[PDB]
Amino acid sequence: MKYLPQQDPQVFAAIEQERKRQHAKIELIASENFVSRAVMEAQGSVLTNKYAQGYPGRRYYGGCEYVDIVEELARERAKQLFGAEHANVQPHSGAQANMAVYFTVLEHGDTVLGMNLSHGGHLTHGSPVNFSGVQYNFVAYGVDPETHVIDYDDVREKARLHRPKLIVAAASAYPRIIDFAKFREIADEVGAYLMVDMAHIAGLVAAGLHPNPVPYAHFVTTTTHKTLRGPRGGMILCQEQFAKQIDKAIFPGIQGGPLMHVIAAKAVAFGEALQDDFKAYAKRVVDNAKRLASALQNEGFTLVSGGTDNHLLLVDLRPQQLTGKTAEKVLDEVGITVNKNTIPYDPESPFVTSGIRIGTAAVTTRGFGLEEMDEIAAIIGLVLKNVGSEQALEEARQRVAALTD
Amino acid sequence: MKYLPQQDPQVFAAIEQERKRQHAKIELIASENFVSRAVMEAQGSVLTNKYAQGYPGRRYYGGCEYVDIVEELARERAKQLFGAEHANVQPHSGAQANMAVYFTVLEHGDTVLGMNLSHGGHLTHGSPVNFSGVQYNFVAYGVDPETHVIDYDDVREKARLHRPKLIVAAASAYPRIIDFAKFREIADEVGAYLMVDMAHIAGLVAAGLHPNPVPYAHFVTTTTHKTLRGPRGGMILCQEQFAKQIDKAIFPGIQGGPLMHVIAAKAVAFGEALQDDFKAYAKRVVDNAKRLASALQNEGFTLVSGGTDNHLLLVDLRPQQLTGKTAEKVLDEVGITVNKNTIPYDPESPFVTSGIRIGTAAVTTRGFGLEEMDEIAAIIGLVLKNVGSEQALEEARQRVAALTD
């Protein structure tokens, strides 16, 4: 940076602290990643100056010829990536992408069936303190109490009982592959739309490492950050038959001016995801997660579902008589960033929890491989088995520093 | 830029086109501005990498110590700027800032009273194709047919008839000062909350050039772009008694993760607005708008309300037998960017209109003064009085180029 250090010392010092923090810590938050310098440059561009309400070639302001090229680049690259008939790259966030789909097909008070929030469903999939649970009548399907895999018979029974207008599949804390074909079969039986929120797994889908929901779902929503490794924002994919209605939901329905600089950053991230090396990256993400799961099991930890098919894993800490909250706090002390996370059938509140959620996308981006996975598992074992030993925590601190340099 | 040109030639070329466009054109879109290099640097920072759901010191992810400093800088600088008891700097946009206020105090189907959209009210103030008009029962107050000033007796009568839970004041195309004391007096008479959407006038309020709605309104919403000259985003100000509820509406109510890099950019823009030279800038904005209004009247144009108290003016093109659509198109041909805009009691549809909206914030930022105002008015006169003369349009084109260099 050149101008910020002089203009705003206070903001610059805090940003610099954050930059140094990102390098020093082992980032295991499953939704986090590190974007390229190209992505950041696009977000730091003059495109923030441009009002471009509407859509490419159908804008409500003149002078949009060049931001149109940008938005179309993002939409066409998204369509290449996922095989979608239509893309909307304007959602400000995952929240707004979901909001717009609901706005498209639901009336106030309609019934929606989503994944149980305590079993891995997202806040925007019916939390009673979120617009989703306030605006619509959400019902939940669950995972098997033993396997922690989505119980597809439960999805079906809930769908047949409650007759939802819309079924939502996908999750913020589900470590196994989701069967979209089965979700669509159930949707079809009850005459519901199917929405897939692939936010967490979108980069894996792009790399052919998770089945693609696009052929099975009426609407696919996603964040552009997470495994897709793009800027913070949302996106909607859908078949051509819903394109006009989806675009109208985003604008003039729920948003106004899009963030054209962020959309530029989306296009860049999509360009990166189209490359062969992104495919290799995403495979390393999944390989690393499997290795980390296996290594944690070697340390004596129990994992929700017994492992992972994707980028993320959930440690069930009940055997260690630890809460997620305690584990999160002590790992923070040694420079490992995780989050407490409810496990299926958690006896604890969501503010305490019996689990921690871990993902490999961010460490993989930094170049961590299988050997680093073994060491991270070993450090987690050292810490969680010795929560009262400051000597053990200091050894952990040094081993973390050795990994990040 | 260093990395984008190599990584993504297609995106870079389009951004470069847009950068050159911004320099070459005379930008008179009333909602547009040019942010500083410091603001853009903050938006192009590593802060995009950080999930920070929740609030400073009350986050749902570890490692937020430094983004907390950033968010608090933004909130405290906002409170200094506007004298507000509480600020929420997380809204993704003006749309979301408004959405969250509605979510805070309204139930589905509640009555809201806002400014007539055709008289200057915004889309999010009750458009039947926007979430506002779909979710709530919007009624409208109007401006006087002669003066084009808000008819405060009409605000009162509509409020007493319809008994709204909430009254909205402020506009996207109102060229006069709004009387917030009178809005609050009417709100009080009927037991309604008062929301002021100061998006357009926020920089003028910050500079003491427009009366401050904060002392009169329960909630004040704004965009951070426009006259405030910040990054694209939203903000909510309110008294301490609504702080907890407003924060809960933004999250977990209507959003998820905030854009921490944009919030950094907000802090920077607020730092700039606190400086003496921003006050001088904002006065030049208003001076330039008054000069431009006067110069346009000298050219024979009729202005809605007979002039302006702020950054913006509306040309009533009926005397010239031109639509806003025709005027917008022909001005585009010579490199002047305006938008068609409905005028009060417009006989034309909002897709055609009888007006153009013009603001001085962007040209003022580029250093345009009173002499430049006279010349812009002279060029507009030359073009609009000679719509069928390619020779006149070419002379206009050359005079525009002379202004931008």
Automatic annotation (TrEMBL), chains A, B:
Q: Which terms are listed as keywords in the entry?
A: Amino-acid biosynthesis, Cytoplasm, One-carbon metabolism, Pyridoxal phosphate, Transferase
Residues bearing N6-(pyridoxal phosphate)lysine (covalent) are K226
List ligand-binding residues for pyridoxal 5'-phosphate 1: Y51, S93, G94, A95, H122, S172, H200, H225, G257
Which chain positions carry the site (Plays an important role in substrate specificity)? H225
N6-(pyridoxal phosphate)lysine: residues carrying this PTM: K226
Q: What is its EC number?
A: 2.1.2.1
Q: Which GO terms describe its molecular function?
A: glycine hydroxymethyltransferase activity; pyridoxal phosphate binding
Which biological process terms from the Gene Ontology are attached to this UniProt entry? glycine biosynthetic process from serine; tetrahydrofolate interconversion
Record-listed pyridoxal 5'-phosphate 2 binding positions: Y51, S93, G94, A95, H122, S172, H200, H225, G257
| Residues bound to pyridoxal 5'-phosphate 4 | Y51, G94, A95, S172, H200, G257
Q: What class of enzyme is it?
A: transferase
Residue positions annotated to bind pyridoxal 5'-phosphate 5 are Y51, H122, S172, H200, H225, G257
Q: Identify the pathway.
A: One-carbon metabolism; tetrahydrofolate interconversion; Amino-acid biosynthesis; glycine biosynthesis; glycine from L-serine: step 1/1
Q: Where does (6S)-5,6,7,8-tetrahydrofolate bind?
A: L117, G121, H122, L123, E240, S349, P350, F351
Q: Which PANTHER family match?
A: SERINE HYDROXYMETHYLTRANSFERASE (PTHR11680), SERINE HYDROXYMETHYLTRANSFERASE 1 (PTHR11680:SF35)
Q: Function of this protein? A: Catalyzes the reversible interconversion of serine and glycine with tetrahydrofolate (THF) serving as the one-carbon carrier. This reaction serves as the major source of one-carbon groups required for the biosynthesis of purines, thymidylate, methionine, and other important biomolecules. Also exhibits THF-independent aldolase activity toward beta-hydroxyamino acids, producing glycine and aldehydes, via a retro-aldol mechanism. Thus, is able to catalyze the cleavage of L-allo-threonine.
- Subunit description: Homodimer.
Q: What is this protein called?
A: Serine hydroxymethyltransferase
- Record the organism: Geobacillus stearothermophilus (Bacillus stearothermophilus)
As recorded in Swiss-Prot or TrEMBL, the protein's gene is named glyA
